[PDB]
Design a protein around this ligand. Structure first.
Ligand SMILES: [Ca+2]
Ligand SMILES: [Ca+2]
Lengths: 192, 527
């Protein structure tokens, strides 16, 4: 639970095919090859959930940084929730952050050749990565597909229709616009 | 996001199939990261969203898997009632309750390249963070995530899905995943399965799931639906499962997002392709992906409603004989197979404007002053369910049209054709529009700039940001895939992009694919 060693084969399209002797090493190299390929993108995706994009790109993204923090979690809250994981997932996520951090160090030692142009243009440096950062980069995207306030947009549509047509007619339109059922909608499940 | 899994009986080769197509946008660096993971007892090749230490689209030794994000109901808004004497208190179960106070500071690079710090304070209720207030009157709104605090557990559940060695272990992982996704599964032994994962709350039956829930404490959630009640199916008799953001099952309800799952849904493009064929192959799925990527979605259902009306008035308007002919001839998609600068079927241009003209003749009078907030419903990206039910003589709660359906269909035909005959030409060849192009930009769905993108124009396609075509043969996963724009997003300090920064775009545009690699023998021959 301390030795190491992983081979990395890059195909004609640059995809890394990793070959380890245990998962702890596999998931360390997993995070390394990805940082080597997408360091700035990973930096900025973490910054999205952390609410730190305005540090780099200005007040245009303040509203976004403000939303990801009022709905997000602190570091302690995330560390608490990572601590509630099973043994193996918790450790492989950590080794994943170590893999990313491995390349971050490698880039800071050879910035001209291993640090992407975005860091040079906007002159800032990538930060090291812990398991919290990996979870944040997961939250920045996956939560976008479940987070919304369409309920409040539905109440707005219903109100403007009520101030125009009255309660009787307004609810009829709304039940057609935002319906409750629609029994003829195509489905994915059909035949047991 | 689309997907498709096929059973052994519905598969030509006999082996199960799987097809991936997540629509997470087109950006450079791409939204996905391809990888090949190998270790004793673990061999998995595929791609996942940038950042995730697990594969979502691909296969391991035992099964292929894929996912599709959608518009499930795991987020409820609660309408808190505030205390007139104290804005920081809301009525909850017969008593005033103090909200939480969270202080946050943001550093900002202002207009002058020097840092700038702004202080903000956000409040949280029992239901979650407050997102809006209303001084008219004494009301505030909070957001309840059905998955709050469980994002980490869903990571492990997805990683556990990677490590699964059979369906039981894969289903156990889907049991633990707490957020709203659709999971897809195909075995080396011909079995396929579909799961609408996510922990879905048990809501009060006396409230309206389309609008915010009162937060007084008498309409709260009461646990989470057991996983066994989520939509799912193991080896369905029809032989396959397709999806493109639609109703999972007749029984499943959506609430705020009902207008995404209607009688006119774009998934019908994938159903049409599976039903028109017998036992299918990967290329058949690729063929359906092409159709889907260029389909004039309105033409799937409305063209027949149009051709009919024109046929019943074939004798009263000389132009209708021609329109009928060109409409029956056209294959309902806007493509550029001839590789010129224009789409191949000018009648699609007529049909485009016919719909636009038709849509307004239905809703302009009553919803015209609200198109900014309702047109995305009535002219929805995935279909026009309401409009179809009106023109199809189906009963509606409100009486939208005050005339006959054929009169409007002809009023739209005549006005559009009249405009096209005087401004362009008398025949369809002169109506063809120039193709619409797209580029892999710098800003993702999440809204942040993560790179420099690409200026390369490629034809617009209603296609997934990535595609996998996997056949689970008795020897292991097999097939082909494509992950544009490229694997490496690195850009040297002097501006030189990685040789693998855009080397997959042309193939993505020219519908060519690279081979899906799994065993070590093939991966060495690719290096
Ligand atoms: Ca809801
Ligand atoms: Ca053409």
């Amino acid at each position: 639970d301390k030795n190491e060693g992983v081979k990395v084969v890059r195909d004609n399209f640059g995809v890394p095919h990793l070959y380890a002797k245990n998962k702890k090493d596999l998931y360390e190299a997993y995070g390394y090859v990805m940082a080597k390929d997408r360091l700035f993108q990973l930096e900025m995706f973490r910054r999205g959930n952390e609410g730190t994009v305005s540090e780099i790109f200005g007040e245009d993204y303040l509203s976004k940084d403000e939303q990801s923090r009022r709905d997000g979690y602190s570091n302690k809250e995330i560390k608490k929730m990572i601590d509630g994981l099973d043994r193996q997932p918790k450790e492989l996520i950590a080794k994943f952050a170590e893999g990313i951090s491995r390349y971050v160090n490698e880039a800071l030692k050879d910035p001209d050749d291993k640090l992407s142009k975005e860091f040079h243009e906007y002159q800032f440096l990538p930060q090291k990565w812990t398991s919290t950062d990996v979870v944040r980069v997961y939250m920045v995207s996956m939560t976008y597909f479940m987070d919304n306030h369409q309920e409040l947009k539905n109440a707005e549509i219903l109100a403007k229709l009520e101030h125009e047509y009255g309660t009787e007619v307004s609810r009829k339109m709304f039940d057609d616009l935002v319906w409750k059922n629609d029994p003829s909608a195509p489905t994915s499940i059909v035949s047991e | 996001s689309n997907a498709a899994i096929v059973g052994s009986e519905k598969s030509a080769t006999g082996n199960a199939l799987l097809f991936s197509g997540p629509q997470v946008g087109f950006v450079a660096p791409g939204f996905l990261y391809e990888v090949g993971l190998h270790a004793p007892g673990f061999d998995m090749e595929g791609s996942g969203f940038i950042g995730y230490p697990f594969i979502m689209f691909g296969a391991n030794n035992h099964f292929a898997l894929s996912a599709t994000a959608g518009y499930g109901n795991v987020t409820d808004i609660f309408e808190e009632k505030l205390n007139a004497k104290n804005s920081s208190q809301y009525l909850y179960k017969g008593k005033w309750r103090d909200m939480e106070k969270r202080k946050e500071s943001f550093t900002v690079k202002g207009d002058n390249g020097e840092k700038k710090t702004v202080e903000k304070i956000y409040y949280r209720t029992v239901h979650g963070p407050v997102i809006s207030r209303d001084e008219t009157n004494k009301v505030a709104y909070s957001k309840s995530w059905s998955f709050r605090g469980t994002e980490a557990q869903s990571m492990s559940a997805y990683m556990k899905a990677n490590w699964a060695k059979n369906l039981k272990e894969f289903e156990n992982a889907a049991s633990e995943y707490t957020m709203s996704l659709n999971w897809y599964y195909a075995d080396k032994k011909g079995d396929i399965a579909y799961y609408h994962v996510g922990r879905y709350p048990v809501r009060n039956s006396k409230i309206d799931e389309r609008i915010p829930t009162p937060g007084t404490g008498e309409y709260e959630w009461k646990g989470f639906i057991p996983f066994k009640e989520n939509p799912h199916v193991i080896n369905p008799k029809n032989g396959y499962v397709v999806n493109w953001n639609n109703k999972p099952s007749k029984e499943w309800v959506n609430g705020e997002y009902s207008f995404y799952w209607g009688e006119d849904n774009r998934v019908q493009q994938y159903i049409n392709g599976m039903e028109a064929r017998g036992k299918v192959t990967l290329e058949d799925i690729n063929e359906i992906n092409y159709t889907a990527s260029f389909a004039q979605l309105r033409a799937n259902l409305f063209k027949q409603l149009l051709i009919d009306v024109l046929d019943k008035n074939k004798s009263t308007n000389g132009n209708y004989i021609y329109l009928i002919e060109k409409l029956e001839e056209w294959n309902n998609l806007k493509e550029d197979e001839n590789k010129d600068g224009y789409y191949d079927a000018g009648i699609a241009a007529f049909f485009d404007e016919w719909w636009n003209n038709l849509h307004d003749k239905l809703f302009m009078d009553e919803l015209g002053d609200f198109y900014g907030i309702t047109k995305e419903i009535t002219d929805h990206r995935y279909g026009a369910s309401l409009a179809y039910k009106i023109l199809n003589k189906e009963s509606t709660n409100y009486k939208w049209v005050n005339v006959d359906q054929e009169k409007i269909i002809m009023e739209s035909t005549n006005e559009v054709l009249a405009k096209l005959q005087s401004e362009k030409g008398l025949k369809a060849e002169k109506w063809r529009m120039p193709i619409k192009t797209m580029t892999f930009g710098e800003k993702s769905l999440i809204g942040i700039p993560h790179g420099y993108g690409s200026m390369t124009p490629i034809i617009e396609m209603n296609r997934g940001s990535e595609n996998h075509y996997i056949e689970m043969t008795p020897t292991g996963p097999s097939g082909f895939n494509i992950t544009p724009p490229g694997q490496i997003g690195f850009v040297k300090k002097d501006g030189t992009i990685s040789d693998h920064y855009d080397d997959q775009l042309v193939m993505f545009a020219e519908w060519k694919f690279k081979p899906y690699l799994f065993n070590k023998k093939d991966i060495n021959k690719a290096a």
